[PDB]
Design a protein around this nucleic acid. Sequence first.
RNA 1: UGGAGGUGAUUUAAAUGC
RNA 2: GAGCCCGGGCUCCGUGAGGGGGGAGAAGUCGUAACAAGGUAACCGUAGGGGAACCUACGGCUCGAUCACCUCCU
RNA 3: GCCCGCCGCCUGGGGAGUACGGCCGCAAGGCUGAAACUUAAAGGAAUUGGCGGGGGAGCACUACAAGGGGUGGAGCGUGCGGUUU
RNA 4: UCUGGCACGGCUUUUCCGGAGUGUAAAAAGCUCCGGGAAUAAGGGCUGGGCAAGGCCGGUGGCAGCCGCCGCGGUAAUACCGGCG
Lengths: 95, 22, 145
Amino acid sequence: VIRVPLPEGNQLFGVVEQALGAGWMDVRCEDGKIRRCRIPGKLRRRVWIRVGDLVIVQPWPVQSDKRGDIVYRYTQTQVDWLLRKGKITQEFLTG
Amino acid sequence: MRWKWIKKRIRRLKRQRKKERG
Amino acid sequence: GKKAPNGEFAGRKLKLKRKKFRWSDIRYKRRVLRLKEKSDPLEGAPQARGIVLEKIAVEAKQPNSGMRKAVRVQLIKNGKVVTAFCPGDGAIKFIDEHDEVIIEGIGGPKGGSMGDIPGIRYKVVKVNRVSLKELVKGRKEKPRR
RNA sequence: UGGAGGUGAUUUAAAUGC
RNA sequence: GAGCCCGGGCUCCGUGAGGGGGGAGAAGUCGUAACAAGGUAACCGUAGGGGAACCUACGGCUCGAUCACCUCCU
RNA sequence: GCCCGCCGCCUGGGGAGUACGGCCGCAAGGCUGAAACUUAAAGGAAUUGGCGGGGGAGCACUACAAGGGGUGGAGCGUGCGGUUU
RNA sequence: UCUGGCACGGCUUUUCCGGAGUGUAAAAAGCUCCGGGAAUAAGGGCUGGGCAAGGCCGGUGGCAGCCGCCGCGGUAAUACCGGCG
């Protein structure tokens, strides 16, 4: 049985657009905005994210439309599962 | 280093002093 | 001769020496001119009220990440833009935009923001002339407008 | 036993890592 | 004999497109500069040149290099 | 070193030996010389270790030479990578 | 629960009420004398190292926060929040 995390609350699916340096990434999100996202350290040590990965984002409580933290990165087969459940669209991933 | 800096300082000076002279 | 002239009538040289060499203490120089008093707004003061233009949250420093609660307040007579660090957990809540917010420094006037915070020179005590440590405790008073 | 010069010098061994 | 006014000059306060640098963030790129002789020793003042680190010339210095070769000194 | 006389210079780092101003210089430049801001270090000597495309001494047979045989060519046995299921 | 605490038994009785003069050269200040008369206003900070002067449980999980510095929070936190000491 396969199990895949999904965005909880106001959390958003996102595709990673650009690497800025220092754990800051520009992420195009599922509501249509580009957020400047932080990688919590607890994450940076565990994974290697890259441009054109799909992520869960936790927006910040101030400037919700401009900043967030990336909170979970998806593998390639999870992304396929999220395409097949209709969680994400193939048109959103490419951009 | 101080090679660097001397010519950087000189280039900054000139270029800027060019911008002042102009 | 370890420096100094020693001699009855020389003293004046002494007297100017010290003073000449006093101005290598940044702190002394600064006060005796009054650069402490001119630059880092306040006009020197203990504290300053100001209108909360908006609420902003900024990032933490180098080993760190966490969303500090900061306001943007405008000092009223000073008429200067100040970004500011807010004590307490929940807080950013009890501060409505366009309530009065009295502002102080925090941890040596030198410029030194505390280790975590990059910029923030200053502290907030108040929301509508009642403080933040009074609003972290539920009973003591609770806010208006 | 420990110190200062003068001149051969050796290209057969390759950038990077949070 | 004041304030007042007028024409010009000079200076200072509130504030402005644009522009300079700093201490940083450290996940993109280029290179390997220095730190080991860093793989062409390194620095140094001066001059030119190169995208960059930097290279080269001339003079200096060892805070200079590793044996080797030669020379001195308790 | 220990004393006595005078003189220059320093007063944490980086900003910066820069800005501005003045002085000097044909020019190139020099002399004089901050502040805003930022940092819990900058630094020095020695100790240990690891390291260097460093030097001496000594061994080795998973070393190399010397030497004998062979793997890599085929068929098959086997375990694996992969693919298939 | 022997630092101390509680029951219970007894004592005294700051504030508080009432009276005398005072003082006022009118009050108030109500002090001061006397009668009545209750065990009856205590808190704030900190407790990782510095400073130690002071440690466990529960929550939380490099978050939220703490922070004067050095650091501390990345799933057993004495450092955060709450409680208990």
